[PDB]
Design a protein around this ligand. Structure first.
Ligand code: CO
Ligand code: CO
Ligand code: CO
Ligand code: CO
Lengths: 288, 288
């Protein structure tokens, strides 16, 4: 390999397989924060929610079910990206650790969503419909396809793929994470919202890490390119939350939801070392 | 792909990425046992050992240091096998889960050994010597090379590679796990032996799982082939523990150590569904 041979993160250097002669304390500290946040789905008590789900309005259940549909496999995709690309291509021991843990936690998120979906939708029909939302519901498909693309895209560089996946884990999740936090505020679905809390704290960590990898990348995509992969994520996430599945359904103001998504992308841009794109304030007090 | 298209474990079937429509409860139960056994190195208290290491005899420290040398990277190799082969080639959600966890736990074992090595060898010279034992100490190299081979071996089949790695995780570790348990018995090195307890319980689980994968493999290697990959592991592990690093050094009877290694391989053969090879009793009461 050429250009790669000059990238600390990817260079075939290791000639080691050991951990303590610690090379990057920043990457290491990130792996430690994650190890510290370990949790199992068994910990989220879903016993009640089954009826909480009943107390809901039809438009709300519609909403929450479509949102779950998406979360049902995305953390699937992620782990399929991390095991056949990142945790691989990267040869820095501290980063492979962070990545080994991320994969373990994505399979737990993945499990969490399923339990959710099983606890709420008992009629088998719907259940299968939601489980295979990747191939049944357009909107989510137009999402899963995006993250699914950077996996097999044989052309994109690790620089571009890290950003894109940061967009998937932060922008593609921010929409729903915000709306789920809304419910919590409004006193609804404590099993949903509690799980949504643990998981969100993980995705936050998975993005900062992605950003951190980006910053250890030498030859990275130009700002304009990054701005465009992020911007596109914003549009696909917006369209999703104020069109194919309007947050109106749970009583939220689309226009503000949009502004939030942008505020999120702005925070992602800072993290990556660039300027804000949209320059808009985070409109939800319970999010800032 | 041909033959593979007919293997449940490897067939490009998924078209899912979700976990709850649970297909194999046996593989699932194995992933749950593992999730349940989670532990962090932070949990092993090494505060004392530094001097316990001093109370030891020179031949014993020699022994324990060379044994650590090996454990310093093997769990490195394993995870490099699991991320760029098994967790990949396998498409069964329950198995990828077990594998996501195994990788997370191997990076912790990997960390555990380093902490050990740092706590015991303070002089930097030795320390680097042991950390790079893969390229410094023959005997271990003749071990790491074996597991390292089935990783890049482009010819071997997933059937053969599962057995071989089961040989690496059970036979290549049994020797040292036995001798470390000896010390525990004889009142020595509680930090070493305690960590050696947690880790051993994991490798046991990693082998049964490997065996379990083998049993879900349709078209597998013939018994003779399996007998030979296992037998070879026995010889390389024996030679190591009664030649290049005789258990004599910690007061153990080589001849019996050999018999143990065979008893271990026999238990591995049963597990895989075959007949015992050696037919010898497990000689250590504290192991059977
Ligand atoms: Co996740
Ligand atoms: Co994530
Ligand atoms: Co291990
Ligand atoms: Co193992």
């Amino acid at each position: 390999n050429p250009s790669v041979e000059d990238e600390p993160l990817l260079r075939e250097n290791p000639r080691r397989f050991v951990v303590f002669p610690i090379e990057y304390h920043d990457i290491w500290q990130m792996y430690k924060k994650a190890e510290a946040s370990f949790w199992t789905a068994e910990e989220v008590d879903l016993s009640k929610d089954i009826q909480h789900w009943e107390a809901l309005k039809p438009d709300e259940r519609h909403f929450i079910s479509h949102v779950l549909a998406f979360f049902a496999a995305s953390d699937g995709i992620v782990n399929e990206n991390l095991v056949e690309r990142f945790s691989q291509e990267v040869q820095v021991t501290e980063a492979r650790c962070f990545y080994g843990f991320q994969i373990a936690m994505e399979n737990i998120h993945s499990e969490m969503y399923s339990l959710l979906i099983d606890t709420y939708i008992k009629d088998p029909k719907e259940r299968e419909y939601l489980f295979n939302a990747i191939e049944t519901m357009p909107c989510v498909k137009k999402k899963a396809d995006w993250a699914l693309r950077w996996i097999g895209d044989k052309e994109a560089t690790y620089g571009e793929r890290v950003v894109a996946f940061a967009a998937v884990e932060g922008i593609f999740f921010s929409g729903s994470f915000a709306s789920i936090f809304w419910l919590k505020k409004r006193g609804l679905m404590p099993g949903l919202t509690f799980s949504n809390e643990l998981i969100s704290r993980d995705e936050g960590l998975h993005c900062d890490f992605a950003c951190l990898m980006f910053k250890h990348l030498v030859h990275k995509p130009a700002e304009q390119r990054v701005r465009e992969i992020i911007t596109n994520a914003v549009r696909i996430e917006q369209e999703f939350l104020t069109e194919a599945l309007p947050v109106k359904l749970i009583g939220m103001n689309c226009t503000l939801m949009k502004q939030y998504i942008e505020f999120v992308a702005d925070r992602l841009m800072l993290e990556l070392g660039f300027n804000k794109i949209f320059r808009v304030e985070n409109p939800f007090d319970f999010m800032e």
